[PDB]
From Swiss-Prot, chain A:
Organism, scientific name: Escherichia coli (strain K12)
Function: One of two assembly initiator proteins, it binds directly near the 3'-end of the 23S rRNA, where it nucleates assembly of the 50S subunit.
Protein's UniProt name: Large ribosomal subunit protein uL3
Keywords: Methylation, Ribonucleoprotein, Ribosomal protein, RNA-binding, rRNA-binding
Pfam families xrefs: Ribosomal_L3
Highest taxon listed in the record's lineage: Bacteria
Alphabetized HAMAP family for the sequence: Ribosomal_uL3_B (MF_01325_B)
GO biological process, one term: cytoplasmic translation
Family: Belongs to the universal ribosomal protein uL3 family.
Signal peptide: none
Residues with N6-succinyllysine modification: 38
GO molecular function, one term: structural constituent of ribosome
Modified residues (N5-methylglutamine): 150
InterPro entries documented for this protein: Ribosomal_uL3, Ribosomal_uL3_bac/org-type, Ribosomal_uL3_CS, Transl_B-barrel_sf
UniProtKB/Swiss-Prot annotation, chain C:
Molecular-function annotations in GO: large ribosomal subunit rRNA binding; structural constituent of ribosome
Protein name: Large ribosomal subunit protein uL6
UniProtKB keywords: Acetylation, Antibiotic resistance, Ribonucleoprotein, Ribosomal protein, RNA-binding, rRNA-binding
Residue numbers bearing the N6-acetyllysine modification: 43
One Pfam family of this chain: Ribosomal_L6
GO BP terms in the entry: cytoplasmic translation; response to antibiotic; ribosomal large subunit assembly
Complexes and interactors: Part of the 50S ribosomal subunit.
Superkingdom, taxonomy of origin: Bacteria
Family as reported in the entry's similarity comment: Belongs to the universal ribosomal protein uL6 family.
Gene name linked to the record: rplF
From Swiss-Prot, chain D:
Protein function: This protein is one of the early assembly proteins of the 50S ribosomal subunit, although it is not seen to bind rRNA by itself. It is important during the early stages of 50S assembly.
GO cellular component: cytoplasm; cytosol; cytosolic large ribosomal subunit; ribosome
Entry keyword annotation includes Transcription: no
Subunit (UniProt): Part of the 50S ribosomal subunit.
Keyword field: Ribonucleoprotein, Ribosomal protein
Gene Ontology biological process terms, A to Z: cytoplasmic translation; negative regulation of translation
Protein name as it appears in the record: Large ribosomal subunit protein uL13
CDD domains, per the entry: Ribosomal_L13
Organism, scientific name: Escherichia coli (strain K12)
Gene3D superfamilies (UniProt xref): Ribosomal protein L13
UniProt keyword Disulfide bond present: no
Length: 209, 38, 176, 142
RNA sequence: GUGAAGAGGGAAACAACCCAGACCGCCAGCUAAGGUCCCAAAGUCAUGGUUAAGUGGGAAACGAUGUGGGAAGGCCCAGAC
RNA sequence: CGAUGUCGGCUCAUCACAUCCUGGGGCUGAAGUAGGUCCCAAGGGUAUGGCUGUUCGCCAUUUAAAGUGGUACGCGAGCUG
RNA sequence: UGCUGAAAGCAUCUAAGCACGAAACUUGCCCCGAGAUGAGUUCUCCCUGACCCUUUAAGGGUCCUGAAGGAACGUUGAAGA
């Protein structure tokens, strides 16, 4: 089905009754409220665009405010879009709550991971370090060789070298949802999800079987 | 079966058939006589 | 050639419709319809069915022969029908029919359920016989080949789903 | 005097619609390449795009002879190393048949900036209708 | 014989292979090798065959009811295969 | 030859398939288990140590397996020496 | 591996037709992605003045206006050379 947009609140644990600690991530999922519905007859695909949270009145621009004003909804902190599953139906301005996950049993959580900046190939690609002694001259963490010789005389595409690690979309699949709390607007999933605390998540039901 | 480049009738029940541009020897008596690729 | 030259004698009460290349034959057993090759010209001529090579095509004789035999089978498939008979050799091999699903117990860790297609009706007079009947010949040949294909006749003992007419040749172990 | 040269500001060029049902791929392709160069016009000039706009339609219904329906293989390499990627003719007709006619014509047209400009005039569709009713394409029976 | 010391056209590209030997000029004609569906000048020419393998567009001993042609021969409507 | 650094180790690969494992299958002198042999298959995977400068090899103990080759016997403006 | 089936009155998985069939192939899963110059789609927001000149054109210039928004600046960040 569709998913909901959360916010990574942090991690805790949930002691079970038989004494098994479960590492959970707390995801506050407020009222995701639908701002646009997309049909084949106008867009070629069925999908809903939701917003969540709240934004300052002076910080939302006039394009954006006109969009949310047409939808008849309070401006949120962003717009996201979920593809619909052929028998689902939503209306504009409809609110969607964490209660949707009261049946789902296992979810997939998509966020932007923590940006580690320009990372070298030992951090980035798990290259193995060369000797730390035994003669080695200024080449301890360096990548080694990068290709062959006259044949090809080029470095191939997607050679693993150093550069920006982190700060990109990653999806963690098949996380066990531990609690759905409709009162406090919370979703407790088992495990770590991507992102620092306060980062926006996207929690969908698991597509894997 | 036997992929050879000379396929032959080893028995009197063996039978040469061309399937999909491939010469084959189909036997009914002995399945060891089944051959391909002549 | 020698097959295409002999005419198909169509018996009474059998409906033959020649819509160009499409041939519909409907008798007492069911409507059954083919579409011949373009190299076959078929002519009724009020009594029988006659098959000839359409002029301008190289292998048309060969094609004509096939059309012949196919329609011959179709005539039997609207008059008497075709019947394959399979038997299950092995300790604890079971066959049953629920609706048109053949349940089979063939020494597996999971039940076998073969869905028969539309035109075919199987029976089981015994636990170790499947007598299946139908109108189209390749379809019951197909289905009998599938049921055989679940557990093929093992060579040393004979255990498997065999045809009732087919002989299964056996052999002994290596030594002793 | 000097030999006439067509001037690309003043080239008049027409719109043609061609139904590609049951045509042979290379033989249609060669006729389209001739019409898109402008080789059929007496004002042909090798550095001026003088050709016509052709709307090919029913591109998924194009025919090939022999076993080329299954044996004709379209290779391309992706730039990444082991990136040799093949696709037979029927796989291409299933995925995008426009690519079949467009690959053929593109390989028959001169390579270079001009022949890219010549290929921009070919408009291929997999169906029977086109958006270009405003340009009034007359039916080129070829 | 050519290259060396020889350009030009052809063989994709290719000293030495095929055609041919450049005094200069010309937005003139005819040709050689090689070619005429499109890139790319010129036959998607005419008549009669052959192959379906993309053979054409690598590769042998050897294998094979692929297929077109030719000359014979055994049996055969006292009925052959 | 007005310089194209040449074994081995390390780091980092990459392609071929004449396949070591895993996957499909035919024959078996294939009862089962385990095999032998041949066809298909390149997705991914495909040891740690003693000795030796060694590649190799022998040995020890693993492993589903410890593939065979090409890549300047890949890789010294990347390291060692 | 077959089913039906002739050429070859039999046989035959193939020539017409039909069904299975593997980690390879195309998808399914994850990420990038309209410079996809073939530059796409959808929603929303903003701008509704006069007047001269000429070799009268998607031409040049003067005055009045300066929107949506962006950029700069600052406080900065689990973003960052």
């Amino acid at each position: 089905m569709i998913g909901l947009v959360g916010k990574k609140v942090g991690m805790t644990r949930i002691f079970t009754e038989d004494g098994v600690s479960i590492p959970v991530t707390v995801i506050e999922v407020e009222a995701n409220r639908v701002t646009q519905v997309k049909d084949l007859a106008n867009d070629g695909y069925r999908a809903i665009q939701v917003t969540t949270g709240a934004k300052k009145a002076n910080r939302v621009t006039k394009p954006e405010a006109g969009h949310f004003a047409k939808a008849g909804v309070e401006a949120g902190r962003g717009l996201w879009e979920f593809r619909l599953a052929e028998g689902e139906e939503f209306t504009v301005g409809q609110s969607i709550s964490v209660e949707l996950f009261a049946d789902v049993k296992k979810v997939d959580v998509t966020g932007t991971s923590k940006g580690k900046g320009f990372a070298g190939t030992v951090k980035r690609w798990n290259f193995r370090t060369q000797d730390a002694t035994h003669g080695n001259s200024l080449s301890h963490r360096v990548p080694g060789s990068i290709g062959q010789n006259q044949t090809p005389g080029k470095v191939f595409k997607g050679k693993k070298m150093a550069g920006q690690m982190g700060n990109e979309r990653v999806t963690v699949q098949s996380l066990d949802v531990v609690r759905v709390d409709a009162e406090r607007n919370l979703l407790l999933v088992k495990g770590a999800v991507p992102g620092a605390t306060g980062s926006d998540l996207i929690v969908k039901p698991a597509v894997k079987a | 079966m036997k992929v050879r480049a000379s396929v032959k009738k080893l028995c009197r029940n063996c039978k040469i058939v061309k399937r999909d541009g491939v010469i084959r020897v189909i036997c009914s008596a002995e399945p060891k006589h089944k051959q391909r690729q002549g | 050639s020698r097959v295409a030259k002999a005419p198909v004698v169509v018996p009474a009460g059998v409906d033959v419709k020649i819509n160009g290349q499409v041939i519909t034959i409907k008798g007492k057993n069911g409507e059954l319809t083919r579409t011949l090759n373009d190299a076959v010209e078929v002519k009724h001529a009020d009594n029988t069915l006659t098959f000839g090579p359409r002029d301008g095509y190289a292998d048309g004789w060969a094609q004509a022969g096939t059309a012949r035999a196919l329609l011959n089978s179709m005539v039997i498939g609207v008059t008497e029908g075709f019947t394959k008979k399979l038997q299950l050799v092995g300790v604890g091999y079971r066959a049953a029919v629920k609706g048109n699903v053949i349940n089979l117990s063939l020494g597996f860790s999971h039940p076998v359920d073969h869905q028969l297609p539309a035109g075919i009706t199987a029976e089981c007079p015994t636990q170790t016989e499947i007598v299946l009947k139908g109108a189209d010949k390749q379809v019951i040949g197909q289905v009998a080949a599938d049921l055989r294909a679940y557990r093929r006749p093992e060579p040393y003992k004979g255990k498997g789903v065999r045809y009732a007419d087919e002989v299964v040749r056996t052999k002994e172990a290596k030594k002793k | 005097m000097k030999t006439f040269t067509a001037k690309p500001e003043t080239v008049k060029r027409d719109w043609y619609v061609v139904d590609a049902t049951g045509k042979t791929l290379g033989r249609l392709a060669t006729e389209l390449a001739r019409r898109l160069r402008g080789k059929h016009k007496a004002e042909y000039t090798p550095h001026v795009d003088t050709g016509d706009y052709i709307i090919v339609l029913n591109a998924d219904k194009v025919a090939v002879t022999g076993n080329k329906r299954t044996d004709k293989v379209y290779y391309h390499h992706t730039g990444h190393i082991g990136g040799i990627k093949q696709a037979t003719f029927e796989e291409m007709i299933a995925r995008r048949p426009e690519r079949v006619i467009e690959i053929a014509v593109k390989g028959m047209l001169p390579k270079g900036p001009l022949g890219r400009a010549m290929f921009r005039k070919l408009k291929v569709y997999a169906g029977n209708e086109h958006n270009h009713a405003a340009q009034q394409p007359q039916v080129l029976d070829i």
